[PDB]
Amino acid sequence: MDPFEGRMTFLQLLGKLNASQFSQIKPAQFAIKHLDLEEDLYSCIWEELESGSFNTRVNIMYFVDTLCEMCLKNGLTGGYLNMISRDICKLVQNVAPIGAAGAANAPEVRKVLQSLHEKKVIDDNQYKDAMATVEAHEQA
């Protein structure tokens, strides 16, 4: 499968996401099956974040959690895991920005951050930084 078909199919799968973990499984399996396209596919995730509603952004945050869990179940250590770890505070800024959406999404982003932290995708400093971002954006 070439990068273009990979992106096209993955974007369609991302369109299926909802709050349920059940909806996040198939896009996660695809992303992993085509790890060779990780850069393309990771950019698909950010494309959907940038143009998505706050509801869509939150569901992508859940998907990111599901993706990381499945990566770990597959015995992977880098790839998506390193990209998500590096970008964790950016992810928080997108899903829970300054203003009222930060308050509306704070508990849901906290749940994901705790999950990523417990599974050692993010370290203590990152978790502390990301949690402080959520608090700042909940309060203002």
UniProtKB/Swiss-Prot annotation:
Species of provenance: Schizosaccharomyces pombe (strain 972 / ATCC 24843)
Q: Which GO terms describe its biological process?
A: mRNA processing; positive regulation of DNA-templated transcription, elongation; positive regulation of transcription by RNA polymerase I; positive regulation of transcription by RNA polymerase II; positive regulation of transcription elongation by RNA polymerase II
Q: Quaternary state and partners of this protein? A: CTDK-I consists of three subunits, ctk1/lsk1, ctk2/lsc1 and ctk3 (also called alpha, beta and gamma).
State the GO CC annotations. Answer: CTDK-1 complex; cytosol; nucleus
According to its UniProt entry, the function of this protein is described as:
Subunit of the CTDK-I complex, which hyperphosphorylates the C-terminal heptapeptide repeat domain (CTD) of the largest RNA polymerase II subunit. As part of the CTDK-I complex, involved in RNA polymerase II transcriptional elongation and pre-mRNA 3'-end processing. Together with ctk2, required for ctk1/lsk1 CTD kinase activation.
Q: Which residues of the full protein are shown?
A: 1 to 140 of 218
Instruction: Drop me one GO molecular function for this one.
Output: calcium ion binding
User: Could you confirm whether the keyword Cytoplasm appears in this record?
Assistant: yes
Q: Subcellular localization, per the record?
A: Cytoplasm; Nucleus
Q: Gene encoding this chain?
A: ctk3
Tell me which family the UniProt entry assigns to this protein: Belongs to the CTK3 family.
Domain CID, first and last residues per copy: 2-138
Domain of life of the source: Eukaryota
Per UniProt, the keywords (alphabetical) are:
Cytoplasm, mRNA processing, Nucleus, Transcription
Protein's UniProt keywords contain Flavoprotein: no
**Which protein are we looking at?**
CTD kinase subunit gamma
